[PDB]
Paper text:
Crystals of the Saccharomyces kluyveri ortholog of Alp14 (herein termed sk-Alp14-monomer: residues 1–550) bound to αβ-tubulins and DRP grew in conditions similar to those used for SEC and SEC-MALS. Each asymmetric unit contained two wheel-shaped assemblies representing two sets of alternating TOG1 and TOG2 domains oriented in a square-like conformation (termed the TOG square), with each TOG domain binding a DRP-capped αβ-tubulin on its outer edge. We hypothesized that sk-Alp14-monomer formed dimeric organization, despite the lack of dimerization domains, due to the high concentration of these complexes during crystallization. In a TOG square, each TOG domain was bound to a curved αβ-tubulin capped by a DRP through its outward-facing binding interface and was not in contact with the neighboring TOG-bound αβ-tubulin. Rather, DRP binding only caps β-tubulin, presenting a significant impediment to the polymerization of αβ-tubulins while bound to the TOG1-TOG2 subunits. The αβ-tubulins bound to the TOG square are positioned in a polarized orientation, due to the asymmetry in the TOG domain αβ-tubulin interface and pseudo-dimeric TOG1-TOG2 subunit interfaces within the TOG square (see below). The X-ray structures revealed that each TOG square is a dimer of TOG1-TOG2 array subunits assembled head-to-tail from alternating TOG1 and TOG2 domains.
The XMAP215/Stu2/Alp14 MT polymerases are among the best-studied families of MT regulators. They localize to the extreme tips of MT plus-ends and accelerate αβ-tubulin polymerization in eukaryotes. Each TOG domain is composed of six α-helical HEAT (Huntingtin, EF3A, ATM, and TOR) repeats, which form a conserved paddle-shaped structure.
Residue numbers in the entry:
A (entry chain I): 1 to 42, 45 to 54, 62 to 360, 369 to 441
B (entry chain G): 13 to 167
C (entry chain H): 2 to 38, 47 to 279, 285 to 437
């Protein structure tokens, strides 16, 4: 369990994707030319995970995205062969990404995926970043996942999927695309981090006091969360070391693998954090719903499993105390029938900018609130049958929408069942 | 198992290799399959030095097996007069019974060990003791034609 | 004479390092294998060039841990064919250790064991080191134990299991893995010493004075107590001189073969009497498994002293505890305390937080109160299996779901077996 192959698809896919490579290249001490200028061994200890030069494949039907990446800061480092781009765009049509145009290109992508996996000592799995309201990131991504799932069934599939919200784009077909895509992810991926644009806006607007958040503002929150949750994977550590061990200790039921991520402290784009937080302060950013990257209230549900990642030099004794504290002082919010379901890990290297930090990955049944929002928007749209001629024209059947609608509602009911469950 | 090597030796009669195995802390009362301790086996095949070695290291002189046989039973059966008096001196059960109802006096009389019969009797053997079929040691001399034994039983 | 050690999973391998580090100091053997100086060749073999090689196999379904062995202080000590590694780990999944991943390497592992057994003349049996909660430790060990009961069936096998504890626990499913291996390894193990990582944690925080112990801290403490148990086999003592005697003295029931080990004294490196250390053997704070023997009946009890000990001091300390405490025994037991002594001093590691003590003792006692430890695992197991939590991971790696229930019934039956003896 060593190497990880990374993929980014669609506009958002390559945006937060490149942002992620910017962050962890710095943290590992790699320059845009691809040379080590660090000063620590804990950095190159597990550099073989994401690098060889990144083990990254860049995908989009929109050919313009090619240059938006290469003209970026770390755009020079990506392998030229690993750019695979189509002629035209999908235009927010999931069917075009999943059945027609995205399907024609998906073979070329699998060829590069094969090439990068071929030269791996021991593959762990894959890592996809993409948006769910789009046509390419959602339609071709979910098609790519299934195509890899069947070509690499002995490996983990881990996605960073961002949820659409009216607060970030007024496109009304996004409920369609996201619902169809959720119907895929619940069946095709081992673990998926739910990035909610609703929550990214509400954090940039209300907590960071930015009246008009841009993509860059939301993308800053994403890339910082990603490096936090992938801290265990990139540096030496006992707990939640590899992708499979993580999913084993996080997902008790195969369909319920949608994590609500959140981390602390919330900073602005290059602002100054005056006083580094204390351990009890970081700890009290868990239930604090203003730190969740998904727009859900943990108070309204119950945690099945929890993983905490503290970055920086601090008291391992105090962290243990505070985590053991917050669990039993809110004992009604953690499921009783899973003992020792919360797991904490520490990493001495903090993230750049901050002295200390803490990321809070949680499988909370409250996530049903998120799927409620998407379904109600989907159903309102679907009951009036709007924009269906887009999808059906590309070979889709009206029945598919009903199945994805029903399958998402079953997913909601399951979360509600285990919320009302009792140990007795 | 060191308790199993000590049975192999005490049986076949390697006097020296008992001291070796016992210096390695072998179980003096180690049972084989049918419950026979090394003292049982040495008293069957007439290895006098091995009997006195095991007894003084702490061997159950009145240990029974799966069929209720004490080492004095087996010594009086085969006819090891040297061993019989060693066991009795170490507190052997002179009127022990086994699953077939026999005492050591029964076995020494059946096998014609007249010299051992007299030793058991003088250690307070039950001359009127009966077996399963209901026969005393005196009945065996009557039934078996041995008048040398009948006279030795009424002495 | 000889005895083979096997180390499975990170726990086994890393505790192995701590033990063979401590064995080489006790036997004056050098890191390169040499010796400027038999009873100790029960554990080591010899090269024609005067080099002493351990009779050990290291197994892990993933290189990282064993890679540090062959690039560490004792890289020269082991032959490279003795250190075996796969590539994909078991991922805290008994199924992968036992079914999916374990079958890919089990044959290579059994083959490398044959090469050490072929060098040996009168092989006694196997010592096995592994965790409970680990996927490799639970799954692969239970598989290897099955196959060793075939290819070497007519000899002994002893366990050194790491009982899990939330303070260092790496997985949620560690109750599952513990129950699953304990079910399938129950019939194939003659005796098994559990090590509760919580007690070792508690001990290191109280008596070694460490805020947050590391694995090295716990492993060093563990290696000391393991050395105390294997001392009788390595120096030719009077008690427990071979692997059979462990079953003879401590196991009066094939199933109930789980002794409680108590070790005193644990002195920080910053002397006690024979009586003082023997009283600490009946103090729960110094046990390796957290339970209360006062709530249970003793089936057997051995005392392994080592160091500056006068045999009469022992008998006084025994009579003191046999008179001034109420150690309840079962009626069908010899109820007499077995004793053995080895006059060599307890070796510590140069730099270790543990100090050199003049004398030391390790009490091995098969009390029925150790059932309390099984009850804690079974309860955690029941909560998760009541909702079939995490079960799909196991079933998806070659395991039938029924095996969960068959294992739980074997654990419930064992809890009844401990109860009926103690009533
Ligand atoms: N005492 C002690 N316990 C350990 C050590 N290493 C791991 N453990 C414990 O063993 C349990 C399982 O971890 P591992 O043994 O590393 O798992 P593994 O056997 O390597 O199996 P996989 O990693 O899943 O392939 C955990 O609960 C740890 O607490 C060790 O060196 N000493
Ligand atoms: N967080 C974030 N979301 C984005 C970004 N770009 C687009 N999105 C979201 O993704 C959806 C649009 O899909 P998009 O990726 O642009 O279409 P695609 O090119 O076909 O994959 C909308 O819900 C947007 O809010 C970005 O840079 N950051
Ligand atoms: Mg595009
Ligand atoms: Mg491992």
């Amino acid at each position: 369990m060593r190497e990880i192959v990374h993929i980014q698809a669609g506009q958002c896919g390559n945006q937060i994707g490149a942002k992620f490579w910017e962050v962890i290249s710095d943290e590992h001490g790699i320059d845009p030319t691809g040379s080590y200028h660090g000063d620590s061994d804990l950095q190159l200890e597990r550099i073989n995970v994401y690098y060889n030069v990144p083990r990254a494949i860049l995908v989009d039907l929109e050919p313009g995205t090619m240059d938006s990446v290469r003209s970026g800061p770390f755009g020079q480092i990506f392998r030229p062969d690993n750019f695979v781009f189509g002629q035209s765009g999908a235009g927010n049509n999931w069917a075009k990404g999943h059945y027609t145009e995205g399907a024609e290109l998906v073979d070329s992508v699998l060829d590069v995926v094969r090439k990068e996996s071929e030269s791996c000592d021991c593959l762990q799995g894959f890592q996809l970043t993409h948006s769910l309201g789009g046509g390419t990131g959602s339609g071709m991504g979910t098609l790519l996942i299934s195509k890899i799932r069947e070509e690499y069934p002995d490996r983990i599939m881990n996605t960073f999927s961002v949820v659409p919200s009216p607060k970030v784009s007024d496109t009304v077909v996004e409920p369609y695309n996201a619902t169809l895509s959720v119907h895929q992810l619940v069946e095709n991926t081992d673990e998926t981090y739910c990035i909610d644009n609703e929550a990214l806006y509400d954090i940039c607007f209300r907590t960071l006091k930015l009246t008009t958040p841009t993509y860059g503002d939301l993308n800053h929150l994403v890339s910082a969360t990603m490096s936090g949750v992938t801290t265990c994977l990139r540096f030496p550590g006992q707990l939640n070391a590899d992708l499979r061990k993580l999913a084993v200790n996080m997902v008790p039921f195969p369909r319920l693998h949608f994590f609500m991520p959140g981390f602390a402290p919330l900073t602005s784009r290059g602002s100054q954090q005056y006083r580094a937080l204390t351990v009890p302060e970081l700890t009290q950013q868990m239930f604090d719903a203003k730190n969740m990257m998904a727009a859900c209230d943990p108070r309204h549900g119950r945690y099945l499993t929890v993983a905490a990642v503290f970055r920086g030099r601090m008291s391992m004794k105090e962290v243990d105390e505070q985590m053991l504290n917050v669990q039993n002082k809110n004992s009604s919010y953690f499921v009783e029938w899973i003992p020792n379901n919360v797991k904490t890990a520490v990493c001495d290297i903090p993230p750049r900018g901050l002295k200390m930090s803490a990321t809070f990955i949680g499988n909370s049944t409250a996530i049903q609130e998120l799927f409620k929002r998407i379904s109600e928007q989907f159903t309102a749209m679907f009951r009036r049958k709007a924009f269906l001629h887009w999808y059906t024209g590309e070979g889709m059947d009206e029945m598919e929408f009903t199945e994805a609608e029903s399958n998402m509602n079953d997913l909601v009911s399951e979360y509600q069942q285990y919320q009302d469950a009792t140990a007795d | 198992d060191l308790g199993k090597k000590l049975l192999e030796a005490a049986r076949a009669g390697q006097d020296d290799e008992v001291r070796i195995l016992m210096a390695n802390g072998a179980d003096v009362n180690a049972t084989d399959a049918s419950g026979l301790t090394p003292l049982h086996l040495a008293a069957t095949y007439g290895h006098l030095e091995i009997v006195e070695v095991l007894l003084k290291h702490g061997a159950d002189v009145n240990a029974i097996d799966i069929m209720g046989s004490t080492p004095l039973h087996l010594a009086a059966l085969i006819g090891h007069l040297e061993i019989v008096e060693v066991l009795l001196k170490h507190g052997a059960d002179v009127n022990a019974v086994d699953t077939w109802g026999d005492t050591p006096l029964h076995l020494a009389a059946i096998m014609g060990h007249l010299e051992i019969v007299e030793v058991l009797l003088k250690h307070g053997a039950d001359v009127n003791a009966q077996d399963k079929f209901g026969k005393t040691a005196f009945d065996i001399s009557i039934d078996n034609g041995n008048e040398d034994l009948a006279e030795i039983l009424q002495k | 004479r000889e005895c083979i050690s096997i180390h499975v999973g990170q726990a086994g391998v890393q505790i192995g390092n701590a033990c063979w580090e401590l064995y080489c100091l006790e036997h004056g053997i050098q890191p390169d294998g040499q010796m400027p100086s038999d009873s100790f060749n029960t554990f080591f073999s010899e090269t024609g060039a005067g080099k002493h090689v351990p009779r050990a196999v290291f197994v892990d379904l993933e290189p990282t841990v064993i890679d540090e062995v062959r690039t560490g202080t004792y890289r020269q000590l082991f032959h490279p064919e003795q250190l075996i590694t796969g590539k994909e780990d078991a991922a805290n999944n008994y199924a992968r250790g036992h079914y999916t991943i374990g079958k890919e390497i089990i044959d290579l592992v059994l083959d490398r064991i044959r090469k050490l057994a072929d060098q040996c003349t009168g092989l006694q049996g196997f010592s096995v080191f592994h965790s409970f909660g680990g996927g490799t430790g639970s799954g692969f060990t239970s598989l290897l134990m099955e196959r060793l009961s075939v290819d070497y069936g007519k000899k002994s096998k002893l366990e050194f299991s790491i009982y899990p504890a939330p303070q260092v626990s790496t997985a949620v499913v560690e109750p599952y893995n513990s129950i699953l291996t304990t079910h399938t390894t129950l019939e194939h193990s003659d005796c098994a010493f559990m090590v509760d990582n919580e007690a070792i944690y508690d001990i290191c925080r109280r008596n070694l004075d460490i805020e947050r112990p590391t694995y090295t801290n716990l492993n060093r403490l563990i290696g000391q107590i393991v050395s105390s148990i294997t001392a009788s086999l390595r120096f030719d003592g009077a008690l427990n001189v071979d692997l059979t005697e462990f079953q003879t003295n401590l196991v009066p029931y094939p199933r109930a073969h789980f002794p409680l080990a108590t070790y005193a004294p644990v002195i920080s490196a910053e002397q006690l009497s024979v009586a003082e250390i023997t009283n600490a053997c009946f103090e729960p704070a110094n046990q390796m498994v957290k339970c209360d023997p006062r709530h249970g009946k003793y089936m057997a009890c051995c005392l392994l002293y080592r160091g500056d000990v006068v045999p009469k001091d022992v008998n006084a300390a025994i009579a003191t505890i046999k008179t001034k405490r109420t150690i309840q025994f079962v009626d069908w037991c010899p109820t007499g305390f077995k004793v053995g002594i080895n006059y060599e001093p307890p070796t510590v590691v140069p730099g270790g937080d543990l100090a050199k003590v003049q004398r030391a003792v390790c009490m091995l006692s098969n009390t029925t109160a150790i059932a309390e430890a099984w009850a804690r695992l079974d309860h955690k197991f029941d909560l998760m299996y009541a909702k079939r939590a995490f079960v799909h991971w196991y079933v998806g790696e070659g395991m039938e779901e029924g095996e969960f229930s068959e294992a739980r019934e074997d654990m419930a039956a064992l809890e009844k077996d401990y109860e009926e003896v103690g009533v």
